[PDB]
Every structure is written in C-alpha cells, then in structure tokens.
RNA sequence: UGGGGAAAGGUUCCAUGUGAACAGCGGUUGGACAUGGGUUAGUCGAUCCUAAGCCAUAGGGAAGUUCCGUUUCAAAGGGGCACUCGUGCCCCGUGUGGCGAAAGGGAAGCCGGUUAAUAUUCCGGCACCUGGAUGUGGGUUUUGCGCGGCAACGCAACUGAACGCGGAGACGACGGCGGGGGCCCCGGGCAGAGUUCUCUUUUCUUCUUAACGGUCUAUCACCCUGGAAACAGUUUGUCUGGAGAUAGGGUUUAAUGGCCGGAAGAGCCCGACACUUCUGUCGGGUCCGGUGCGCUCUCGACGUCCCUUGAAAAUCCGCGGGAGGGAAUAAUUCUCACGCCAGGUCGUACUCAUAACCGCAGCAGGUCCCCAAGGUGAACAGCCUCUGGUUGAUAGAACAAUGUAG
RNA sequence: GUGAAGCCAGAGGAAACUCUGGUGGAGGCUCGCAGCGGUUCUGACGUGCAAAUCGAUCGUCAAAUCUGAGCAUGGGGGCGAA
C-alpha cells in the first residue's frame, strides 16, 4: 500500500498555515523592574479582526522608561474593554476588568484569561473566545498557587505567574449552526487545508487501514493501541470506553 | 502660452536678454490684433481690440529684434 | 461612431491603465491615459479630511510652496482644528489638577 | 416620480405663506403613504 | 524635507564662503 | 399586511434546512441585527461590524462585547460579584 | 470573416524579376524561388521596490556527492569635518545580504504632416520631470526670522540640526440614486450629392478643437448669531436634532463645467483659373437649440452580507522640539518669478490564426484581453442593413438504385 | 419572475390586540443569451476534418462560478469532494 492520508500532513507541502492577513501575535509584555515592583499605564488604541479566530484582539500603547519612543502591544479583548480605557499592569494595580496583575496579589475566586504557565513566557493558558481559568488557594510558603482549567483538569503554576482580569470576549460563537457548507468553507479556508474530508470505510484497501470489501464495513477492531506503528493509528486511539456517557 | 493684461509690461517682456523672435497677426473677420512674442520659457500674448494703438506701439518696442506678420496659407 | 484602441503594450484593464475618450482637431476618436486620482490627507487623531490642503499623489508634493502645503497655526498638518482645541483644553485642567493635589499632600503630611 | 412631483409642490407652498409647517408636516406624511394619486387631488385636500 | 535639499543648500552655501574669503 | 405569520427573518431560505434549525437560528439572527442604546452618549446608535466588536455611529467609540449581543449573562454576573468582592477584601 | 495587443513565431514585412520543385485541378499569381531594402525615445516599456518563494554568510550533521539553517548560543555597521597633503580627528548604534512581477506599487508629451516599407521616436509648433552650478527682480531685518480674518482660514515668498509623532502609497462583493465626458435621437441654417410618369418646403454627407496654464463656479463637511413640543428638517429607500435643529451669513477637498491663451495660420467641404512635366494659385464656409428608466466609462453620498472583515516595501510630504547661523550699509540656508547645462544601455518590422502559435501539414480541433452603429423587440435573443472586410476552399454535364440532411 | 427583514398611512375593538394598502429589494431561489459541462439520438464519420471530431436535443448560469501569469509537492514517491 501507500502512505495513508494523516501521514502526508507531517511533511508541510500542502497543509500548512495561511498567515499572509495575520499581523502579530498576541502576547504581554517581557518582565521588567517596573511591572515587577511598581505598575505602568498604557492606553486602548484600536480594536481590531484578526481572520482565522474569534477573541477580537485590542491594540493597547505604552512609553519607554529608558529611552524616548512609545512602544505598541497586541493583547486579546476581554468583555467590557473599549477603546479609550487606560490599563494597568504591575503588582500594585487595582484589580477591575482589564487589569494585568501578579497572579499571588489576587484574592481566590477571581476568573482571569492568558495565563502564564511559566513566569515570562508571555501567556499561555487560556485564551480563546469565552473561557477563563479559576483560582482556588495559595501557599504562601514555598510559593505555589493552584488553578482550575476550562477542561475541568487542576494544575499547580508558580505565584509569580501573570494573568490578565476577565473573561475573553467572543460570548457563545459556537451556537448558531453553520447551516451551509459554504459557511463551512469559509471558515475554514483561511486555517488549514483540511475541510473536505473523505471517509475511510469508501477507501480501497491500497489507501487506508479501513479500505474495500463488498460492503463497507470496518472488519477488525476499530480501537487502536497506544504503542502501534506509525501507519496503523486511525481510529479511536487507546480508548477506555465507548458508548454515550451519562453521569459526566 | 501666458497672458498679459496690459501694455507696460508687455515692452518689459520684449526688452529682455533673451526674447528671440516676435510676431503680429490680424484677424478682419472679427478686429483684433494678436502680438505674440517667443521667449526661452514660453510664449507670450497680447490681445488687442483697438485699431490705432496697435501701430504706433510696433515703434515703441526694441529696434534689435524682428516682426513678421503671419501670412494665410503658411508652406512647410 | 468610430472604435478606439489602446496605445500602449498592456492590454488589459488592471486599475493601472487609465484611459479616456476624446475628440480631435483632425476630426478623429482617440484615447488618453490618464493618471489615478489624488487622496486628502487626514486627521492625526480623528480621522476627517483636513480642509484648505488640496489631494495629489505622494511624491506630487514636492513642487508646491511650502503656505500652499499647511495652515497657519500650532499642529496646522495633520491636526483638523476641533481636535486641538481639546487639546489645549485637556493639557491646561490636567496641570492644575496637578498642582493642587500636590501642595495639599504636602500640607496634610505636613500637619501630622 | 410621482413622490418626486408631490414634495416639490408642497415647499413652494410653504415658502410662498399659502400653509404653515404643522399642516406641510402633516400633509408630507400623508403623501409619504399612498395617499394622494396625482397633483390634481392633492390640492382638493388643501382647499377643503 | 529630503536629504538632497539639507545637503544642497550646505554645500552651495560653503562654496559661496569659500570664494569670499578666497578674494579677501 | 403581515406576510408571514410565523416564518419572519429566516423566511429568505425558503423550505430548506428543516424546520427546527431555521427556527433556532432565528433566536441570535434577530438580536445580531437589532440597534442598541449607547452606554456613553446615550444615542440609540450602536450596531455590530465584526464577530465580537461593537462601535457606536455618533461617538466612534468602539467596544469589545459578546458574539450576537451587546453583553452576556455569565459577564454581567462576574462583574458584579467581583465589584462586590473586591471591596470587602480591602475593607 | 472589423480595428489593435500579451504568450508563441523569427524576416514570414516592401520593391523588382523568375526555368524546374511546392500551393493533393490549373497558375502570368503567392506566406514558395532569386536579387536588394526596411525597425531612430530624458516623457512607451525593461532598469527601481517588495509578495508567495529561492540562495550565500554564523553554526551543526554526513564516509561523501551534499542536507538543515535566513536571525539564529556571531567582536557582523554609518554619519560628520578639517588640513599644506592622502595620513589625522569627533559623534550615533543592534547589526540586520542578494534574487524574485513587460497584468502588483511607479517622476515626466500632445497636436498636424511625412515613407514602397517606422513612428506618442522622424519634421514644425507648443510643454513637462529629475539631477547640478549660478545671477537679476521682488520679499524680510535697527522690535533680528511676514501680515490679515471673531472663526473655519487666506497670500507670490515668509530660518529649523539630533530625536520623535502622524498622513498619503494602501486595497472585499452586491443594490438602487445623482453629476460629467463620448455615442445614439429630434428641429432650424449654409454648401454638395440621389430620385422625380405622380408625390415629397424631400432623402444622404461635412459643420472639429489636444496636452499644458489663468480666471469664475460645482454634492459631503466645517465656522459665527440665536435657542426648538401645537416637535421640526428631510431621502426613491427614516435618518438627523439642547453632545445645539430650522433660519440668516461664510470657509474649504473635489472639473472629463463656462470664458481666454494654445488656435486658426490647423484639418475638412465647395467654387474659379492656369499646364507634358518641374508645377501650382485665388476666393468663400466651417453656426443656433432640444430631449431621455437610452448604451459605455468615471466620480459622489447612501445601504446590505460575513463563525469570510477582504497584501507588504521603495519614494514624498506635514507637525512637536529648539542645535547652529545671521544686518545698518549692507546681510540673506527666502519651498517667489525669470534665466544656464545635461539626461547613459537594450526592445520597437510583421502575424496573433478556417494559411505566420501547438497538434508529423497551408488539419472543420485548441489557445489570455481592449473598442462596439441603425431597425423590430423586455434584451449583447433571432432576422435585415451602414462603416470596414471578403467573394477563398477542384470544375463541366445528366437527375437511376441505396444513402446523408430538410 | 417571485417578493424576506426594516419603514409610512388607515381601519376594527371595552381592553388584550388584530386586519388592509403601500415602500423596500434578501435568497449556496427561479426562466433564459455568452462562457463552462457532456444526458439522448446507442444520429454523422469510423484506412475520418479529427489517434475522441461534427449536428440536433440537453445540465448550471451571481456563486462550493470560469480563467491568465509567478510559486510548491517527485516514483513504493506526490495529489485525490475516492
Ligand atoms: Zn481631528
Ligand atoms: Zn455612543
């Protein structure tokens, strides 16, 4: 046989990312003595749509301390921003809707958004349109602090991790249907190319694990094992249950 | 092409370093008298309605160049 | 009732190849190209077209007289004239906010 | 054409003193709605 | 204001000093 | 004059798509295109221009806000509570 | 089946002559044969900038031809001035390389004539852009770097280094509405032509105005006075208004609008004289209105759709800031007017297709665009005609079967 | 051709509310020219005009429509609404 569809897509001819309409990417700004004992101000410029993704992003301007010139930053909006709003970022800095604060100088029970995972590494936790993460305890000594992710999983991150007040604006994008495959077309061509996906039970057996027969049908097991060769994972893999769920 | 509203300046333009070639062509059908005027730049135009200030001036201007009036029906 | 033609090697209609019908003192329909079409500059904060200053293409702007070019005031590019009023407005209140705050902190730590 | 024809009467009425604004105002919406066929029947209604 | 113009006027400006101080 | 007894803004995809998702679409269709009282200038000028990004006509202010409403039920409840939160913490 | 082009073709373009061969018949004809001639650019392109993408440099793999890597664990640059003179001095720095579009971005030329064959290039006239040195007129100053308007702002000028901020280049698809150029249509007038047994104050043709400048206007918008409910203004389409409407008075972005220069001396239409040619010449004319869900291009204010929001760089301008420099017999770094010099290299003929391209060929196949008249009619439907182009596909005679098409 | 939201006016009712006439111009809607495709005649030709063409009849036609140039993927490999 051949090379099975999800084998070609790791070599990035045809499947890569479209980012001619991308501008920047979202981050916060590098550590700095400033927001690290103090705070600093910087204003809501613009408002803006980038393609590909809900989450509208707010361009936000700060100054220099050390030289002259004013320096431009893209974050993601959360829901009540608008342009014309003065920011704060620092430890010392009231914590209201839009605010960028240590996560250690936070009260528990406060939801926030793009969340450091690594103290510096500019946000990476949660960041897409409508979710949050929730704090729920500290430890003041040996400082560690533990959250709870939009999946339901608990971790335990660093108490000087940063993390910006909120919840991501974008409201319930996944509610209306699509309702047309051309909306589906839209929407996914200008991410990946990966829409039109055919079924591997009408596959020849020359193509795809599931291929021919005089029926289609799978014929074997279609649960996979975790340690299989590279080729033979198509399908559930390493599953521990199947069936509709009914308590969670 | 540039215009010249009156006369005094008219003799200014002509009276310089370099204007080259002059000329001078009546219309019947409608009485009027064009005096055009070849600088380096452009070409200058002075319209006349009148019938006596148009001789009379012809003396006023340098003696150095030359007038030829335009004659109908010109010949490569 | 006479058809045109193009005068130039491009034959297609690609926002770069202007043209225009005319009618010429030998009796005869041609074709002009012609250039595009100026833009007015804007605002620097609010975004309007700024009145007294004429559109030309961005590199036109280099043989024009320097009084035909702005107005004859403080920001007179690039500012429309409403936005500046603020502006001095704004800077005058913030100073004697400024001012006021400061002297009454000094005189209340003062007191104690 | 007809919406045209209508709006234009009635400003030179109100400028010339033959009504006043609160029944041109009234009349304009009267004819915004099909009211009034042509220009003939809209002077009727300004008479009586 | 291009680079061509400050540069243009410095130098016709030097080149007009130096003949002066030349005849003097 | 009515035109329609039941159907309204999902009347333009005909007898396609089925009943129940042309009449569950209707619920944000109508609230995406409606006009909105503006929170600043108080002009009854607001109108959606992007997915999640709200701008009024009259003011040019712009707004970051839900994907077909001006506001959601889960922001609104946060706010408050952490209004509320907030200022028995540092009192 | 007209008039011109991109890819491709490569002398097939024009003139003179011609045995055989080729043009599935002939041939005095030819895209065939023989001998000569023909493609002129500061303004049209390439050259300049980047897009998807490709390749050097610092490095690390591999026995090796070489694979990765494009800002990465790199000591990576560029700006100013003076001597006697090359040598010497003084400032700013994270750096940040090349290639890639004849449809993307982009400084600048129009009309008339001319050759057997080229012309936005040649000839005549009238212009424009960039770069470089310089003078005259005017402007400013003894209060050292201009005045006027309440204001939006105006004018022939009217200092501005380092550093920094902003604008233009710079952008989707569709729907109706309004302004402008061109074409189409109707009436009158002057010239020429067609028809006339009978009728027709008849039917047809010409009546044109370039780039580049001056001056006067033209939707949106903005400024001043004043303060609205018996609510008003208003679009084909309900938006606007104490965050200041109606009304009155003003400033400004936008001519493919009117008048003048260019420009009548041009071009075109008639009439009258000359004569082997070389040649020509002298009279006239080249106006005034109307209309429109008309066709085409362009501009402007609106509206709709999106889980879709519809490129980057070179180049140029404006502002904040105040470094340096500067007169009282002149001084002057005035973006004002006029005046001086120069603008290198390659392509430019012709076809673009029932014969110049690809299909073994002079093959009913295939191959990307621009302009688009009259009538019937809802119409780029079908049918007939004008400008323009063809009359080229082997022929003559008779009308049986069987056929193909009607 | 049909005529969705939004807007104007009028009429009926004690009220709650309901009717009627206009305006407007949405839709992977519809008839139908050019382009694109290739259902039937199992038509023509079948040492053809042609190593896939010709004629009539047909499918779609404002959107998952048609198309030029520049660039990328190379053989047990690519690409595939299969
Ligand atoms: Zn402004
Ligand atoms: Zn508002």
Redesign the interface.
């Known amino acids: 046989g051949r090379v099975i569809r999800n084998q070609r897509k790791g070599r990035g001819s045809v499947f890569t990312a479209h980012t001619r309409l991308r501008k920047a990417p979202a981050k916060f700004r590098p550590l700095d003595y400033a927001e690290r004992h103090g705070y600093i101000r910087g204003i809501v410029k ?2 803006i ?1 980038d393609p590909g993704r ?3 992003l ?1 361009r936000v301007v700060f100054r220099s301390p050390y030289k002259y010139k004013q320096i431009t930053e893209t974050f993601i ?8 709003q003065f920011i704060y970022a620092g430890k010392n800095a ?4 839009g605010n960028i604060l240590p996560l250690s100088s936070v ?1 528990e ?3 926030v958004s793009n969340v450091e995972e690594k103290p510096g590494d500019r946000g990476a936790l949660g960041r897409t ?2 979710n949050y993460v929730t704090v729920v305890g500290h430890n003041p000594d040996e400082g560690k602090t533990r959250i709870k992710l939009p999946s339901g999983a608990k971790k335990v991150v660093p108490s000087s991790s940063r993390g910006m ?3 991501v ?5 996944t ?3 699509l ?1 047309k495959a051309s909306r589906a077309k839209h929407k996914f061509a200008v991410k990946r190319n990966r829409w039109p996906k055919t079924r591997g039970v009408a596959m020849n057996p020359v193509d795809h694990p599931h291929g021919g027969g005089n029926h289609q049908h799978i014929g074997k097991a279609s649960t996979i094992s975790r340690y299989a060769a590279q080729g033979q994972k198509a399908g559930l893999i390493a599953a521990r249950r199947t069936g509709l769920l009914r308590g969670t | 092409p540039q215009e010249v509203s009156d006369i005094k300046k008219f003799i200014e333009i002509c009276r310089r370093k370099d204007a080259s070639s002059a000329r001078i062509k009546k219309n019947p059908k409608t009485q009027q008298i064009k005096f055009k005027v070849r600088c380096q730049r452009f070409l200058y135009t002075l319209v006349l309605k009148d019938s006596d200030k148009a001789e009379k001036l012809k003396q006023s201007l340098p003696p150095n160049l030359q007038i030829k009036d335009v004659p109908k029906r010109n010949k490569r | 009732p006479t058809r045109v033609t193009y005068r130039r090697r491009n034959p297609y209609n690609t926002t770069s190849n202007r043209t225009r019908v005319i009618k010429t003192p030998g009796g005869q329909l041609r074709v002009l190209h012609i250039k595009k079409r100026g833009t007015a500059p804007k605002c620097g904060d609010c975004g309007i077209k700024l009145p007294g200053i004429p559109a030309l293409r961005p590199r036109e702007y280099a043989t024009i007289s320097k009084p035909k070019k702005t107005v004859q005031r403080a920001y007179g590019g690039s500012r429309c004239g409403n936005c500046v009023r603020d502006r001095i407005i704004r800077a005058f209140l913030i100073e004697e906010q400024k001012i006021v705050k400061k002297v009454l902190k000094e005189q209340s730590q003062a007191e104690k | 054409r007809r919406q045209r024809v209508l709006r234009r009467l009635l400003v030179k009425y109100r400028a010339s003193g033959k009504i006043d604004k609160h029944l041109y105002h009234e009349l304009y919406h009267l004819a915004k709605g099909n009211t009034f066929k042509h220009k003939r029947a809209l002077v009727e209604h300004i008479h009586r | 204001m291009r680079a061509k113009w400050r540069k243009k006027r410095t130098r016709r400006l030097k080149r007009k000093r130096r003949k002066v101080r030349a005849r003097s | 004059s009515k035109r329609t007894k039941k159907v309204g803004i999902s009347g333009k995809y005909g007898t396609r798509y089925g009943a129940s998702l042309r009449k569950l679409v209707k619920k944000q269709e109508v609230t995406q295109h409606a006009r909105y009282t503006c929170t600043f200038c108080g002009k009854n000028s607001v109108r959606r221009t992007a997915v999640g990004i709200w701008s009024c006509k009259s003011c040019k202010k712009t707004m970051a806000g839900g994907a077909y409403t001006v506001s959601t039920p889960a922001a609104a409840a946060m706010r408050s509570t952490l209004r509320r939160l907030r200022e028995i913490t540092e009192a």
């Open positions: 613009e408002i749509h809900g989450a509208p707010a909006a959360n829901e009540g921003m608008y342009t014309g009231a914590l209201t809707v009260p029970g406060t939801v349109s409508g007040i909120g919840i604006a974008g409201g319930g994008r509610d209306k249907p309702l």
